[PDB]
């Protein structure tokens, strides 16, 4: 459960990404592929090398999903329901992998927004990404 301060913290930190949203989503994916190579096997149709147009485009999609969750933080199961169906039913993503992308999103934010990434904001962002991950892994069947 996210507190009022956690919601403020996440909105404020994410607010500072501005036009770089897509770029940071793409960077987090690259960080995940390089650090945790088991995750690459879900993208056989993409080239995962640096500067990939496919990773750049996917990073914009991931960022848009995260902004949806920030904007609808009190109704996240509903906001992310279609995406939760996709990741569990069609893509069969192993739940462990959400922890890995979440960590890489934290690293990316820390590398670009050092004034925002205080210990309290770090904690809020971790809880937020853990909540997104809980929703995205809620539909296995």
């Amino acid at each position: 459960v996210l507190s009022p301060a956690d919601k403020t913290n996440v909105k404020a930190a994410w607010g500072k990404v501005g036009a770089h949203a897509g770029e940071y989503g793409a960077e987090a994916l690259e960080r995940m592929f390089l650090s945790f190579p088991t995750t690459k096997t879900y993208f056989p149709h993409f080239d995962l090398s640096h500067g990939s147009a496919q990773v750049k485009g996917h990073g914009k999609k991931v960022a848009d999903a995260l902004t949806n969750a920030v904007a609808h933080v009190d109704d996240m199961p509903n906001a992310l329901s279609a995406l939760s169906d996709l990741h569990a039913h069609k893509l069969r993503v192993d739940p462990v992998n959400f922890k890995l992308l979440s960590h890489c999103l934290l690293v990316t934010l820390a590398a670009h927004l050092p004034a925002e990434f205080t210990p309290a904001v770090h904690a809020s962002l971790d809880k937020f990404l853990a909540s997104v991950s809980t929703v995205l892994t809620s539909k296995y069947r």
């Binding site: 960077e27 690259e30 960080r31 390089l34 650090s35 945790f36 640096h50 960590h103 890489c104 934290l106 690293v107 990316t108 820390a110 590398a111 670009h112 050092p114 990434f117 205080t118 210990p119 309290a120 770090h122 904690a123 971790d126």
Partner: protein, 146 residues
């Protein structure tokens, strides 16, 4: 664990710039704030009531310096992390009963601190090399459970 020479160069070049009196307290303090069940193990440290209290607690800073010194030792012995961490494994597993998932969590908090402190220099390939390091340290620390 497996680091290539180019990863080792990446890892040790950055590490030479780390402030060893501060980064371990920053990582331990962030562990206690972000994963607050870990506070169960630090009751004698006193005031952990707020993020500012944790990060400014001199016992957190001092203990974090010890933690970081163990990581430095692992960096200096990447090909024998098990021997390097044997007594710490006996302590953390047999004596303290810390669940070994928390070793992974502390390593990843350290990665976040390095990202924060090095910014653009903490490139994706540099991170990947540090993930091998913190995975190898956690696995060695957990050896008494295996």
């Amino acid at each position: 664990v497996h680091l290539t020479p180019e990863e080792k160069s990446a890892v040790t070049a950055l590490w030479g710039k780390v402030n060893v009196d501060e980064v371990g307290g920053e990582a331990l303090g962030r562990l206690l704030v972000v994963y607050p069940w870990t506070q169960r193990f630090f009751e004698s440290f006193g005031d952990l009531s707020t993020p500012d209290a944790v990060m400014g607690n001199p016992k957190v800073k001092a203990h974090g310096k010890k933690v970081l010194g163990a990581f430095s030792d692992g960096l200096a012995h990447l090909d024998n992390l098990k021997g390097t961490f044997a007594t710490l494994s006996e302590l953390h597993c047999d004596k303290l009963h810390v669940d070994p998932e928390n070793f992974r969590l502390l390593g990843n908090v350290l990665v976040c601190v390095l990202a924060h402190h090095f910014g653009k220099e903490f490139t994706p390939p540099v991170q990947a090399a540090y993930q091998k390091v913190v995975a190898g340290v956690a696995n060695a620390l957990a050896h008494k459970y295996h």
